């Protein structure tokens, strides 16, 4: 209901709209007497210096930090300095038979990220016929992962898989 | 307890073949075979006579219910009113069938006696209104049928051999 | 056969203490009122020196 | 007389349209801090418009409540209070009064939240039953009877408004070994000889005495009879309807009943 005043203060819109302070001040200060308004030691510091300068993303260790004892994991030549941040290698230890480790070269944290590519695919998985078929049950099982994680979900179906390698 | 019965409202085809789908949906829904009863029906000019679920009849035009006899408790005093009451017009058609039992529960579908007539169906519960939770199971059973229309504000109550003014009603409709 | 079948449940029951010490004992309570056929029986797990696992 | 709800109701209504237009107010007295992008403050603005109609229609709403008070104010209790203060030391009675009912709600919110106990353990008469069922009867709609034919040991009934009575025979305390039937189906007055047990139905209401078994099994306090019987009592009255069936439809099975939490729902499914 109380529509003409909202319109009028609407008219008002360019930047000549400072005489609001002698028609409303007066009054606010008439009914409200209040000194403490902004007395108190403060000052605006919006941003001084952000950045790490000092350790890779702290979620990817952070996560990768809480995994399981069973894996292990290291660094190799430093090739992935500033944005890869990761060059891990993984040695499954449990009851079952080792294997060659992964790459783990991870992208930004939207993880459209096949880390592992298998350098040394070809004559380190046609080596044996047995570890052969754990890379080609590895490989099949992968295609159906939507959008996996380097860093929880490709390992864990990597173990999973290599777990299973005793059908 | 007794709840009222239903007439045939699907009629759509072959009386044989209705029951016989109607059968085979009870099946489907999953029951077992609870025997098999009939619905005596012989009107007098009236009282209509009936016997069901077990030693004991009925017949009454217009009355309170005053059942409490068997057949033949009742047969004797008919015969005996020779002259009285003896109006044994045509006898009146009357249905039977088989009953089958879901789960605290218990169906009846009736037949044709001369060949033109209905092919009723019957159902009762096990509580005291409760018209509410057994219709949908009929709901769920075949489509819009079961009007119930009980004898509400009441508490006839409980409906004891009510459904006989709607098995005559729908003898009359020939 | 109410009779053995009774008796059978009562030994099994009681050598279920024997047959298992370490692990947490079982205490035995019968009704008070036994019908000729019908009978009820309570039994709790009873954890050792505790009152408050009664779950 | 529980008008004080909606009473409070309106006050903290008309200390909100205060509060909202004293706010309203003083945001007018300047414009946008910082925008360097648009005028976006209509939408702040827009805002309080909205609460301004908010309020207004809070007013109304309870302008339409709250019809009107009883005529001869107090009732002419605190006429000792209204006397002189010849007798009056009257502000004292006042005083005990707010002070007992603020006492009473902090025992029993603190009675409530101590229902978390930290007791690792707890270690170091036929003249209460009658007492308890005669509490117990002075309930409505819930007729209770009792002739004990086989000893010490009691034995009672319970009726609703069908004729599903259910038969409860336990010990002198506390309630266990019970059975339910449904219209007239036991006849336990002189089934047979006598109030006979019998211990069976027509295969309908055996999941309705195993949700009370199990019940019985569940309120099994340590102490209080009173209160276990009261629990009891109160969790068989929630079956006066059976029509209601949340969490599903009301034709998934026989039947739907499982409240031990004062609340009922579609039962096999928890």
Redo the contacts between chains.
């Keep these: 209901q109380p529509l003409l005043d909202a319109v009028l203060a609407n008219i008002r819109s360019p930047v000549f709209n400072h005489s609001l302070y002698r028609t409303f001040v007066p009054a606010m200060t008439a009914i409200h007497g209040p000194p403490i308004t902004a007395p108190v030691v403060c000052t605006r510091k919006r941003r001084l210096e952000d950045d790490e300068r000092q350790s890779i993303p702290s979620v990817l260790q952070g996560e990768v930090a809480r995994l399981d004892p069973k894996f292990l994991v290291n660094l190799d030549p430093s090739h992935c300095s500033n944005n890869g941040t990761v060059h891990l290698i993984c040695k499954l230890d449990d009851k079952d038979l080792p294997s060659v480790p992964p790459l783990e070269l991870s992208v930004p944290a939207d993880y459209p990220a096949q880390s592992p590519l298998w350098i040394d695919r070809q004559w380190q998985y046609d080596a044996n016929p047995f570890l052969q078929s754990v890379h080609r049950c590895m490989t099949s099982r992968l295609l159906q992962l939507p959008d996996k994680h380097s860093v929880t979900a490709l390992l864990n179906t990597w173990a999973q898989s290599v777990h299973q390698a005793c059908l | 307890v007794t709840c009222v019965s239903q007439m045939p409202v699907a009629e759509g085809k072959s009386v044989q073949q209705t029951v016989e789908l109607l059968t085979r949906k009870l099946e489907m829904l999953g029951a077992e075979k609870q025997g098999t009863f009939c619905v005596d029906c012989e009107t007098y000019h009236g009282k209509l006579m009936y016997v069901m679920h077990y030693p004991l009849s009925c017949f009454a035009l217009f009355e309170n219910g005053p059942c409490l006899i068997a057949d033949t408790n009742f047969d004797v005093l008919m015969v005996k009113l020779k002259g009285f009451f003896q109006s044994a017009k045509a006898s009146k058609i009357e249905t039977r069938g088989t009953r089958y039992q879901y789960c605290d529960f218990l169906v009846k579908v009736g037949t044709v006696t001369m060949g033109p007539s209905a092919r009723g169906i019957s159902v009762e519960v096990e509580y005291g209104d409760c018209w509410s939770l057994l219709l949908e199971f009929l709901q769920s059973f075949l489509g819009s049928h079961t009007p119930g229309a009980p004898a509400v504000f009441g508490n006839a109550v409980y409906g004891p051999a009510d459904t006989m003014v709607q098995y005559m009603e729908l003898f009359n409709k020939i | 056969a109410k009779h053995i079948f009774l008796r059978s449940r009562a030994a099994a029951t009681i050598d279920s203490l024997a047959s298992r010490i370490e692990d947490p004992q079982i205490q035995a309570h019968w009704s008070n009122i036994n019908d000729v056929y019908e009978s009820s029986v309570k039994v709790l797990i009873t954890s050792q020196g505790y009152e408050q696992i009664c779950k | 007389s529980v008008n004080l709800e909606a009473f409070s109701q309106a006050i903290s209504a008309i200390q909100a349209l205060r509060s909202s237009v004293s706010r309203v107010?003083?945001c007018?007295?300047?414009?946008m801090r910082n925008k360097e992008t648009l005028?976006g403050r209509?939408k702040a603005?827009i805002a309080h418009?909205q609460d301004?109609l908010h309020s207004?229609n809070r007013d109304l709403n309870e302008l339409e409540r709250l019809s009107n008070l009883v005529g001869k104010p107090s009732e002419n209790h605190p006429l000792h209070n209204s006397g002189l203060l010849s007798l009056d030391p009257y502000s004292q009675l006042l005083q005990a009064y707010k002070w007992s009912n603020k006492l009473q709600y902090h025992a029993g919110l603190a009675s409530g939240l101590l229902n978390q106990?930290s007791?690792?353990?707890?270690?170091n008469p036929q003249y209460v039953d009658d007492v308890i069922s005669r509490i117990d009867r002075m309930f409505p709609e819930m007729s209770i009877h009792l002739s004990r034919p086989?000893?010490?040991?009691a034995m009672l009934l319970v009726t609703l408004g069908?004729?599903?009575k259910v038969i409860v025979?336990m010990?002198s305390l506390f309630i266990?070994?019970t059975i339910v039937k449904?219209?007239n189906e036991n006849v336990y007055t002189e089934d047979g000889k006598l109030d006979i047990?019998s211990?069976s139905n027509?295969?309908?209401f055996q999941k309705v005495t195993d949700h009370a078994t199990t019940a019985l099994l569940h309120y099994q306090l340590?102490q209080m009879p009173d209160v276990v019987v009261r629990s009891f009592m109160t969790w068989l009255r929630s079956y006066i309807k059976?029509?209601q069936a949340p969490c599903q439809?009301?034709?998934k099975?026989?039947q739907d009943g499982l409240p031990p939490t004062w609340r009922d729902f579609r039962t096999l499914e928890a």
């Design positions: 107010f003083d007018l007295k300047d414009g005028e209509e603005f418009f301004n207004v106990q007791l690792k353990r707890s270690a086989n000893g010490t040991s069908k004729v599903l025979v010990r266990d070994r449904g219209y047990w211990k027509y295969q309908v340590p059976l029509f439809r009301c034709g099975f026989l």
